[PDB]
Structure formats: structure tokens, C-alpha cells
Design a protein that fits this description.
Family (chain A): Belongs to the eukaryotic ATPase subunit F6 family.
CATH topology of chain A: Methane Monooxygenase Hydroxylase, Chain G, domain 1
Order of helices and strands of chain A: HH
Helix content of chain B: over 70%
Subcellular location (chain A): Mitochondrion; Mitochondrion inner membrane
Oligomer: part of a larger assembly
Strand content of chain A: under 5%
Number of strands of chain A: 0
Protein name (chain A): ATP synthase peripheral stalk subunit F6, mitochondrial
Number of domains of chain A: 1
Largest interface: A-B, 11 and 14 residues
Number of helices of chain A: 2
GO molecular function (chain A): proton transmembrane transporter activity
Distance between the termini of chain B: 98 Å
Radius of gyration of chain A: 23 Å
Structural class of chain B: mainly alpha
Keywords (chain A): Acetylation, CF(0), Hydrogen ion transport, Ion transport, Membrane, Mitochondrion, Mitochondrion inner membrane, Phosphoprotein, Transit peptide, Transport
Radius of gyration of chain B: 30 Å
Structural class of chain A: mainly alpha
Number of helices of chain B: 2
Largest sheet of chain A: none
Shape of chain B: rod-shaped
Helix content of chain A: 40-55%
Chain lengths: 66, 61
């Protein structure tokens, strides 16, 4: 993604060492998981709430006439 | 994922009624009251109108 090869050897392989594992991507990291669960629900609260894996179909209405 | 796709077809597929009537006696609550408006009061009103016109003839003598 970026450069220097001895330092980046330490890091760029460590980009993908994380990705070079995917059940806990050499660490998902319990803290990451915990705060993730916090923000993911809290995000949900900060969102609109009508389930995000469901289609909001239509509604119908009838306007004032005298 | 597949949410957007599911939604895609389903949204592109999802359809809508069009909002009800209430009060459309007007089309009718017209024409009958319209017969009162026009014809019934009209004709009577012309019948009035004529007598004065005939009598303004008379008053022209």
C-alpha cells in the first residue's frame, strides 16, 4: 500500500498478516469486538430503526374531503 | 448483502394503490341541483322575464 521495504516488511506483511487470518484476522482483538458491538448497536440507535435487512414496502392514505 | 438486490427486484416490483375517494357526490350533487340552477329556476325566471317584456310592449302603448 506504501513503502520502505525493511520497515514495511515489518508492517506491510502486517497489513496482510491481519488479512492472512480471518477468524480473528491475526487478532480481530476482543476489545475491537467489544467496542464494535457497542458502536454497532449504538450506530443502530443513531440510525433510523426499521430493520435494515427488510424491505419497507408501501402504505396507503385517504385525504380530507368535506 | 443480497439486501440491495432483494430490495432491487422487490422495490422495482413493489406497487401502490391510488388514494381513496370521499365526497364525490359533487358530480351528481351538481347536475340535479343544476336542474334546479338552470332549468327549473331558469325556465320559471324566463317566464317572469317574458311577462315584463310583454308588458313593456304594453307600456310601449
Amino acid at each position: 500500500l506504501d513503502p520502505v521495504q525493511k520497515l514495511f516488511v515489518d508492517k506491510i506483511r502486517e497489513y496482510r498478516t491481519k488479512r492472512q487470518t480471518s477468524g480473528g484476522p491475526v487478532d480481530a482483538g476482543p476489545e475491537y469486538q467489544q467496542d464494535l458491538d457497542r458502536e454497532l448497536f449504538k450506530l443502530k440507535q443513531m440510525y433510523g430503526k426499521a430493520d435494515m435487512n427488510t424491505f419497507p414496502n408501501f402504505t396507503f392514505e385517504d385525504p380530507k374531503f368535506e | 448483502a443480497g439486501l440491495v438486490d432483494d430490495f432491487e427486484k422487490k422495490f422495482n416490483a413493489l406497487k401502490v394503490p391510488i388514494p381513496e375517494d370521499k365526497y364525490t357526490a359533487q358530480v351528481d350533487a351538481e347536475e340535479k341541483e343544476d336542474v334546479k340552477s338552470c332549468a327549473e329556476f331558469l325556465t320559471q325566471s324566463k317566464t317572469r322575464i317574458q311577462e315584463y317584456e310583454k308588458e313593456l310592449e304594453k307600456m310601449r302603448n
